[PDB]
């Protein structure tokens, strides 16, 4: 119900070469699971509960074809941990 205001100084800046840029700081959203019945639920299934975790155990790989972009996370073993049983793969295997 409340519009986004700017002040007079900012308006004067816009009345020039100056342009507003948009940056996305975060995105909330849900994933789907099946409940005890056959129904798919996406209500309490918050993606932000996994973002930190996935980023901590993964390597980032991004493919840029010029027009499209594809971003991936591939799990990798923790270096010092003897109890980490994540299989080791090469960069080529991970890309494939």
Partner 1 sequence: EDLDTDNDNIPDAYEKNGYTIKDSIAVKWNDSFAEQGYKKYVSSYLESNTAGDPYTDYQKASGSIDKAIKLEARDPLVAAYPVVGVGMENLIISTN
Residue range at the interface with partner 1 (CB under 8 A); choices 12-20, 21-29, 55-63, 66-74: 55-63
36 contributes a contact to partner 1 by CB under 8 A: no
82 contributes a contact to partner 1 by CB under 8 A: yes
Instruction: Please identify which residue in 19, 26, 52, 67 interacts with partner 1, judged by CB under 8 A.
Output: 52
CA neighbor of 30 nearest in space, from 43, 39, 21, 20: 43
- As a three-state string, the secondary structure of 25-91 is CCCCCECCEECCCCCEECCCCECHHHHHHHHHHEEEEEEECCCCEEEEEEECCCCCCCCCCCCCCCH
CB of 86 to partner 1, least distance (A): 11
83 contributes a contact to partner 1 by CB under 8 A: yes
CB of 3 to partner 1, least distance (A): 15
């Amino acid at each position: 119900a409340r519009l986004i205001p700017i002040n007079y100084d900012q308006l004067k800046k816009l009345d020039s070469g100056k342009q507003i840029k948009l940056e996305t700081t975060q995105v909330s959203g849900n994933y789907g699971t099946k409940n005890s019945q056959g129904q798919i639920i996406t209500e309490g299934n918050s993606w932000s509960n996994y973002i930190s975790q996935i980023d901590s155990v993964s390597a980032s790989i991004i493919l840029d074809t010029g027009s499209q972009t594809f971003e991936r996370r591939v799990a990798a073993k923790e270096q010092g941990n003897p109890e980490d049983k994540t299989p080791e793969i090469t960069i080529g295997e991970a890309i494939k």
